[PDB]
């Protein structure tokens, strides 16, 4: 079971579970309009969702949960997960966001609402921060898994002993991933003080990622397209192998 | 910088000393009550903020931005802390204690109500301490708005460095409190993580709250940049 993994075993499992990088729809009309870019981003996200499920199922401890809880975590976290992926990819492209290898955008290219440019600006900042911190791949997979387990946990609520067990199991897996992060940092040769400071610096960034997702989710719901937001039923369907 | 020299004990002492008082609701409609209470709390929050070590080292403009971004999170975490010992209830004030069902009469707040309850219950199961609480609140103040400063000028860059250094000092403080309490090294890193991860959820609740204010046509109750600037300048 997941709770028995060593730090080295957890890292290996997470790295192996990594999803592929997808391309955006090839050769779209350029310049973009507000709708056309959204069409590209939405299509891309839709295609990544499938791979995210595959990834999620390989996150140690995820499948120990009921299907309902597995769906609830994905519901709450999908955009955060996509965004941290985006920020990781964009690290060595200052001033730009690498949504896909064939879709590298600066803050002016894509046509966007001014609410969108704020989010874009926030994504860029986060990416620079990771660049500055010299974030490592092994740390990234830990953070992405933390987002998956953490984002929807406080809203299980609640009662039943089983509901409590589920929450308890999530927190224990979270603890193991924390252990893993620290193990990586110590292994790298950071002092105890630097280890504890870096951990905190990384986790605090997650709150910003939650903010960006909240803002993005907000915009998504204001689109009279009745969908790019995956439903509970859709996510559940996708979960059944 | 003065802040950068503080020990863990001094940091805690300063923070405990800066705590605002717990205010009473004057009239014990939900929007009417939150508004009356929040308006009076804001005044105390500004003065609490100016007492957080490192905060007044920032430009007046940067202080306003931090508060602008953090204000609802700070109100909300105060509420969660106050409600900690009241399972199933939110203690908006000593004379305003609400359960989930009175939280239904209040329209689209039921979900936010539930999230708040869930956070308070998390605090309860963690045995969150007053000393840890004041650290968390300070972290929210310095962290929520730091990524949207605008960089550019040398000053804004120097401002961000300073914020990050103070945050590191608060991390040190938290760890010290835990070691002092007898936690093993492992338990210290774990609890640190658990505490900080709750902040993602507080941000989430603040965002839903804002979302709800706008849909309620209550955009007006939000402290504006200029309002905050004038309160600080006092
Ligand atoms: O791998 C991926 C795939 C898609 C996204 C992505 N980010 N944003 C926010 C955003 C995107 C562009 C410009 C401004 C904000 C999105 C929005 C949106 F509606 F939230 F914007 C809608 C659909 C997808 C995205 C991503 O971050 C990573
Ligand atoms: O000590 C406290 C603790 C909580 C609140 C608070 N304000 N708001 C929005 C709000 C309403 C009116 C005026 C200002 C803010 C809240 C909402 C929300 F869903 F309504 F946002 C939901 C739950 C709590 C609050 C508070 O104001 C003070």
From Swiss-Prot, chain B:
Gene: ESR1
Biological processes, Gene Ontology terms: androgen metabolic process; antral ovarian follicle growth; cellular response to estradiol stimulus; cellular response to estrogen stimulus; chromatin remodeling; epithelial cell development; epithelial cell proliferation involved in mammary gland duct elongation; estrogen receptor signaling pathway
UniProt-annotated stretches for the region Self-association: 1-234
One example GO MF annotation: nuclear estrogen receptor binding
Keyword line: Activator, Cell membrane, Cytoplasm, Disease variant, DNA-binding, Glycoprotein, Golgi apparatus, Lipid-binding, Lipoprotein, Membrane, Metal-binding, Methylation, Nucleus, Osteoporosis, Palmitate, Phosphoprotein, Receptor, Steroid-binding, Transcription, Transcription regulation, Transmembrane, Ubl conjugation, Zinc, Zinc-finger
Post-translational modification, as annotated: Phosphorylated by cyclin A/CDK2 and CK1. Phosphorylation probably enhances transcriptional activity. Self-association induces phosphorylation. Phosphorylated by LMTK3 in vitro. Glycosylated; contains N-acetylglucosamine, probably O-linked.
Lipid tethering residues (S-palmitoyl cysteine): 135
Comment block on domains: Composed of three domains: a modulating N-terminal domain, a DNA-binding domain and a C-terminal ligand-binding domain. The modulating domain, also known as A/B or AF-1 domain has a ligand-independent transactivation function. The C-terminus contains a ligand-dependent transactivation domain, also known as E/F or AF-2 domain which overlaps with the ligand binding domain. AF-1 and AF-2 activate transcription independently and synergistically and act in a promoter- and cell-specific manner. AF-1 seems to provide the major transactivation function in differentiated cells.
Name used for this protein in its record: Estrogen receptor
Keyword Transcription: yes
Note in the entry: Selective estrogen receptor modulators (SERMs), such as tamoxifen, raloxifene, toremifene, lasofoxifene, clomifene, femarelle and ormeloxifene, have tissue selective agonistic and antagonistic effects on the estrogen receptor (ER). They interfere with the ER association with coactivators or corepressors, mainly involving the AF-2 domain.
Chain positions covered by the region annotation Interaction with AKAP13: 1-234
Residue numbers bearing the Phosphotyrosine modification: 225
Natural source organism: Homo sapiens
Annotated stretches, region: Transactivation AF-2: 7-234
């Amino acid at each position: 079971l997941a709770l028995s993994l060593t730090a080295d075993q957890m890292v290996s499992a997470l790295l192996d579970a990594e999803p592929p990088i997808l391309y955006s729809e090839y050769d779209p009309t350029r310049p973009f309009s507000e709708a056309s870019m959204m069409g590209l981003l939405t299509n891309l996200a839709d295609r990544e969702l499938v791979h995210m499920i595959n990834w999620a199922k390989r996150v140690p401890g995820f499948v120990d949960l009921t299907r309902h809880d597995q769906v609830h975590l994905l519901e709450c976290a999908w955009l955060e997960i996509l965004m941290i992926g985006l920020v990781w990819r964009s690290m060595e492209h200052p001033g730009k966001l690498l949504f896909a290898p064939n879709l590298l955008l600066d803050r002016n290219q894509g046509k966007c609402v001014e609410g969108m440019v704020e989010i874009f600006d926030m994504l860029l900042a986060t990416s620079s921060r990771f660049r500055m911190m010299n974030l490592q791949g092994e740390e990234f997979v830990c953070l992405k898994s933390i987002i998956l387990l953490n984002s929807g946990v406080y809203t299980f609520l609640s009662s039943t002993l089983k509901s409590l067990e589920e929450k308890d199991h999530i927190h224990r897996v979270l603890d193991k991933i924390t252990d893993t992060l620290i193990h990586l940092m110590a292994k790298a040769g950071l002092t105890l003080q630097q280890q504890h400071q870096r951990l905190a610096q990384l986790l605090l960034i997650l709150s910003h990622i939650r903010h960006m997702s909240n803002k993005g989710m907000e915009h998504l719901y204001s689109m009279k397209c009745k969908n790019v937001v995956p439903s509970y039923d859709l996510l559940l369907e996708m979960l059944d192998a």
